[PDB]
């Protein structure tokens, strides 16, 4: 209802207003400067009107930002821009023809206008990003991955070790390009022990400091609530003893793992003298058996997810299948909070009952990012970049089924107390309007505050910091959050396209959201969020794929909705929409995707040639030899 | 009806019987020995009970035959064998459970039994062929294609020629592997003139000989029926003059084309010092633009279809789209003879009216192979191997729609004078039984006679042969006819699978046909059909693909047919059939297809290594330099 929207909007607008004021004040306090401006310290640049920050955020045009933040951050940010390019003219047209037989034909025509515009824009954006990627890569600094190919499923041999098989194999098949190699080892036990040792030290330091300040008796029952019901009577000597125990376990484990041939996985990082050679290995079949001696570009050293390297290659299919099933159940059992929320969604008292379902849904979805990253880690991927992309994919599907589809269905089920979809879709538009103001407008404004790291920064300074530069760990903003930023906005691209020929009233909320998200994230990208890995926008083709899916869904729903008119004869025309859209997808795929998947040999040659000319005496072997060993082994 | 089948079978059996007798006698006459045994003359091995030939044909186990005939001939022949492996147990089971609620479940169960058996067999056959291919290739003699990659769509340049661009490009990107190259030229006008010159000479020789035998007046009006109404009064001097005219045109054209830079196409055959290098080029992207500097393995010198090399790369899409449309109309307008045949298909007089529709259909389809090769040539492919495979594909589709589907529909339309398919399919089984005996049993038996080349051989000896060794042209058996052999048998694989859970009576005809075709073609492969090109069974994955499609079609038709039972509840089970079948296809595709599409670098290295050791002083450059120029230029 209009009264509900009026009230909900006022609530979210005021919260955003207030959050920005609070932000404006907190950021001026010098004691938290390392939280709000964590970058620039990380980069060695810094030491020691409330909304002015908005226009400041618009400085640093793409080329400055790409070098400052990285390509992924810039390409990600452009997604919000993309949506404005697509939806603004849709909103204008839809409003113009829906807001004051022919209605029937109008909807059909609108579908083509919207599809065509969207496809046009996506084509141009896809191409632009591909060009950005090539320039970025061409000018990229030297990194170990440029010369390194990861070899998987090296076949077993009764006499030769993995190292021996790999060296021989490559000297024969890649003679005078082969440089060196490093065998993958199953050091997970060791790494796990080492991480625990560090955790124990933090607690020891905590208690030593607490005691030094107040020289009294400790009573910590491990967890306090459900720990082991002891007292940790000395607590300093308790943690010292626990540390001494693990220290010995670590010394022992290091000696056993480095002398245990069973710690060797049939995999290795293989390096080459030139990038050209690496480029070749990454793109050709090596042996007769298509699932042996497999090659791919190695992740850069801090993209490598070391835990997954211990998974036998051959077990990956099973892990993936199990998770396909788990995903179903995850999606399936979420219907309970959906139905709950839709039940809730039914004068000041009623406007809040109207408002709150938005929040309830948001809260139930709060732990989804965690669940999905965990199941993604279970499936082996071996890199951070791949895992984050995989989880984003699953999140997206979940939103389609649980946030959009199930909500419409559950909605109709409650309202009802054969094409019922005819009213269920426009009916529930009210819900989505409230929802977008809640995890959207208000959400983004709240995020600029960075309250979570603010608090942890200060607590660490208060209790764990003892000396200088341990404040470097306190100062950790995390990443941009591709994992949640992207599937969230895809929900909105879908809803926009679904309702543009139905309910034009939804689009103004979507447009505000895209505009807001753009300015808030641009601001933060510049000041916070140091990147954990540099992908050259590898995720872009997936973003594209998902938008196309949204077009197909909207087109199909329209066909359904207009399939009620007697002698509608809608299908002879509407069928063209998913056909042409799919055709468009394949065209763009074949024409532009190679930019993101295969490295042209010519680029490798130009790059190798120039590097040599610029640096004629590079000890490449020394450079690459110690890369990719393991962080646990120094 | 049983009476119609009895009579039709007797007719076709007796014709086959007689054809074999005639064959048995004609092959014993020495004057046609070069027709029936054309091979063995071509190979330099030969010079100068009626059915004994059947057991003789079973000698020469695969390895002898592969070397004698070639891999393609053997793999092709194995297709008939494959069908027996699939259909025999189907026929046994179907007969056992259909020939003396439960009927409903029985049909569902049979569908899984049949699908599973078929998939099992296909998997094993696919793998076996892949292994054969690798061994064949590993032991293959040296050929120019092993070192040559065809480069397409070389970008234009204002200053450099195509030759100059190619040499430079490869020296930079493939240094010290690049050996040499040859630029593609548009010599089609010249080649056309040369072919006509030869044709005119044959006519001149004809008339000179005719005259020498009978010194009188010629009156040939060019074509006789609708030629130019003149007399060719001298006919010798007429053909001499026509030849002298074309001779001058040829001399001129040769000088203009070899000095005309516009005759150069932006394409070249590029050779490398090693196979390893060629293997790399064929499998990697060369430049930024994914549709420039494109590489693929060059066809061997007598696979190259020179006419298509004059087609600009960029025009290929349009040519293909136009032909997609043409194919529709081709298929569409064939409905007229289909309806005619089905109209015809409606006591000795009636049994023949019953019989003849088989033949009528066969005759109308007689020119389809020609039509399809022509449209395939229109689309550029550049090789004989590709064109033949392409045409076979289209032929297959035509059979599915026009021979199977349209026949069932037209059939029902006539019998009728909502699921009518429920009776239309088993009803028309009678038609297919007659049809298989006609272009099947009788067909193959007739083919062993080789009457067409028999006649032409003798006519040439009588009128064009003047001297020795021009009988070598008379002796030309043509090829195996993959173009028609394969899509024909796919029709029968489909019909078998469609009717196995419906009408078991069809399968005994199919099994006889496969058995007969096997022995007749095996016989002929050994004695006649010199291969025009050697593919290493590249077509195999397509054969596989088509059988899988047949499984899906049968499974879907069953779902339709059993979807009439009240509360059939067939779909919860039957849906598994196309799902599992598709899964199976992807498994096999990913697991085995690489054998037929990509050459492992290791194989290239092993091959290059051994060849060098065996032949330490090979002038590879001299060997490859003159390959791939053009047959017209000497």
Numbering used by the authors:
A (entry chain A), B (entry chain B): 3 to 50, 71 to 122, 156 to 401, 420 to 490, 502 to 718
The article reads:
Previously reported as putative ion channels sensitive to osmolality, a companion paper characterizes OSCA/TMEM63 family members as a novel family of MA ion channels conserved across eukaryotes. The structure of OSCA1.2 reveals a trapezoid-shaped homodimer with a two-fold symmetry axis perpendicular to the membrane. The bulk of the protein lies within the membrane; the transmembrane (TM) domain (TMD) of each monomer contains eleven TM helices. Topological similarities with mTMEM16A suggest that OSCA1.2 also has two pores and could conduct ions through a structurally analogous pathway lined by TM3-TM7.
A comparison of nanodisc-embedded and LMNG-solubilized structures hints at the positional flexibility of the subunits relative to each other while in the closed state.
